[model samples]
Target: LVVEEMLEQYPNGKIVRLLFHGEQAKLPIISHIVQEYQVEVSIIQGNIQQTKQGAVGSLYIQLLGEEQNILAAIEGLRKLRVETEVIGNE
Candidate 1:
């Protein structure tokens, strides 16, 4: 069973998409995901070419952490203009 009968994921599971544009894509995002928030991220599919502005890519990642952490992590990514969308949870 999940964290709830009508829930997407348990307390520590999530699958979300992250899109990076302009110079923001060059950021050490994976590092931040691991160190800053103590969350886990896995790249699903990505394609980013370096340009004058930096790299642009949509990095699909599945983040795993406590409920609060995942929410905050998504919010943090959004603040950086890394568009996020929840695709799955466990």
Candidate 2:
């Protein structure tokens, strides 16, 4: 409903979609990645729900940082078994 408002702001770097499965959503993933990789993250959209396994969600976010930082952040997510896809690069 308020997707437009949420989409108003974005970084000029990389746009990515993160798919969190089961218990993965329970972790402070975004925060961890930002801190670990020094990458700025802006939420574009997301829907997370509690599940028997833990929680699940798909989040669209814009990442602002050096190219290497962005790549490393995505890699960290994959290493944690979280699915990540680059939707756009700018």
Check candidate 2 and list the clashing pairs: none
Q: Put down candidate 1 lDDT per residue, 1-90, tens digits, no spaces.
A: 222332233324676767666845447877876777878876555677777777776765667777888888888888867788775343
Once fitted onto the true fold, the runs of candidate 1 whose alpha carbons sit more than 4 angstroms away are 1-12, 23-26, 88-90
Q: Which RMSD does model 2 reach against the true structure? A: 3.9
lDDT of 1 at 35: 78
Candidate topping lDDT: 2
Best by TM-score: 2
lDDT of each: 0.68, 0.79
Tens-digit lDDT track for model 2 on 44-82?
888988888776889888888999999999989888878
Compute the lDDT of residue 12 as modeled in candidate 1: 40
Off-target runs (Cα >4 Å) in candidate 2 are 1-11, 23-26, 88-90
* TM-score, prediction 2: 0.80
Error of 2 at 61 (Å): 0.6
